[PDB]
């Protein structure tokens, strides 16, 4: 039967910033600290003053560069405390759906090669990705003539995402906007293999 | 007794063992500025392993090196499946608390 | 020395931490099972729709022996 060979890649940008501690974790931090002093075993004022003013003089880099943008979905730095997933709008001759970056593969190209090609096909950048194994993360088949779409997985080591103002609609979705942007069940279930954490 | 149907009812040594693509021996090296953080992460990863049914042989540590000190820990792992390895290391990646060094180095 | 009220607050702290980390491990295990079954059904579909690709799906990449990736930070460069 005539089969439409299609692959894809569910890119993962890891969180560079650790998630903030909840007040519950803060209470447990206070408890572990106080038991630490309880279990511990044995002019300082000037040194303490110098050290605290050294702490004060340098301002810590903000953990959240997100409150000020509110619209920079195309920016690689949309979120820091959580993972990000690339997601580009696509327009077909008969369909127009917010679709995870797909690609066409041939039997002469293996799945890993298709993923590597997709790494720089639509982004036209110098991004640095890493693959773990050939085992996929999801499959979704929609027919009109057969078809299948393979949602793979990769981790971003580094990225020179040049010309961030790309003509495409690359939006970084962590978990929440997935269901807002991808309505059909064949595309809204990506969270099943996206690491929600 | 040998000739009775109950022969060998008391044998146990056969129940004691004293001594498809899958990994080899995996060493996870954790060098960390904190004894407390290193120990906590070692406990967490060991708990993940023994909850996911991973053969863990050793959880020893390297000797300290001074050049402040960094405490080192080792976790031994054996037995991974295709998807299982992926989930295992992605969970490890996402569950690293603060400024710790992982590794998937091999023996020797 | 210590008092009764602080001890009671400590006990309630232990109780609420038990509940919190129980929810934590429950959600972690839910993610585990969800994506594991997703990958199992993915492999099954790949086997069904491709008899020559499931054999090469099980092979493992040889670049993972010297794996390296740093953890989170607070002040990005």
């Amino acid at each position: 039967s005539p089969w439409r060979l299609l692959g894809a890649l569910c890119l993962q940008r890891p969180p560079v910033v650790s998630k903030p501690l909840t007040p519950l974790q803060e209470e447990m931090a206070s408890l572990l600290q106080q038991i630490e002093i309880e279990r511990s075993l044995y002019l300082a004022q000037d040194l303490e003053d110098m050290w605290e003013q050294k702490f004060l003089q340098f301002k810590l880099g903000a953990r959240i560069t997100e409150a000020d943008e509110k619209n920079d979905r195309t920016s690689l730095n949309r979120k820091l405390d959580r993972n990000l997933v690339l997601l580009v709008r696509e327009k077909f001759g008969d369909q127009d759906v917010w679709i995870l970056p797909q690609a066409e593969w041939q039997p002469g190209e293996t799945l890993r090669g298709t993923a590597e090609r997709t790494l720089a096909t639509l982004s036209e950048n110098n991004m640095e990705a890493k693959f773990l194994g050939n085992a996929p993360c999801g499959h979704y088949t929609f027919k009109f003539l057969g078809a299948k779409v393979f949602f793979f997985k990769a981790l971003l080591l580094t990225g020179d995402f040049s010309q961030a103002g790309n003509k495409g609609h690359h939006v970084w979705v962590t978990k929440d906007e997935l269901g807002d942007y991808l309505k059909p069940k064949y595309l809204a279930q990506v969270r099943r293999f996206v690491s929600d954490l | 007794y040998k000739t009775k149907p109950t022969h060998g009812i008391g044998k146990y040594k056969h129940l004691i063992k004293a001594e498809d693509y899958e990994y080899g021996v995996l060493n996870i090296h954790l060098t960390a500025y904190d004894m407390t953080l290193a120990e906590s992460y070692a406990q967490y990863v060991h708990n993940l392993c023994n909850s996911l049914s991973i053969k863990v042989e050793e959880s020893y540590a390297m000797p300290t090196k001074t050049i402040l000190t960094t405490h080192e820990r080792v976790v031994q792992i054996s037995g991974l499946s295709a998807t299982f390895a992926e989930i295992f290391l992605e969970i490890i990646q996402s569950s690293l608390p603060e400024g710790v060094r992982l590794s998937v180095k091999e023996h020797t | 020395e210590l008092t009764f009220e602080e001890t009671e607050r400590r006990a309630l702290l232990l109780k609420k931490w038990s509940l919190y980390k129980q929810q934590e491990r429950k959600m972690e295990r839910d993610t585990i099972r969800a994506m594991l079954e997703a990958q199992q059904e993915a492999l099954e579909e790949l086997q069904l729709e491709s008899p020559k690709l499931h054999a090469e799906a099980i092979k493992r990449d040889p670049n993972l022996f010297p794996f390296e990736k740093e953890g989170p930070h607070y002040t990005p460069p």
Binding site: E36, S40, L47, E48, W51, E52, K54, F55, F58, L60, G61 | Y33, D34, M35, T36, L37, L68, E98, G99 | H73, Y74, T75, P76, P77
Partner: peptide, 28 residues
């Protein structure tokens, strides 16, 4: 043991349980 922030070479502040709270460490 105290929570001192440390940076190795490129401005990545990490808490460490370190004596004598410095609140800022930089390896040259």
């Amino acid at each position: 043991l105290y929570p001192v922030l440390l940076v190795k070479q490129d401005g990545s502040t990490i808490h460490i349980r370190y004596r004598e709270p410095r609140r800022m460490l930089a390896m040259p």
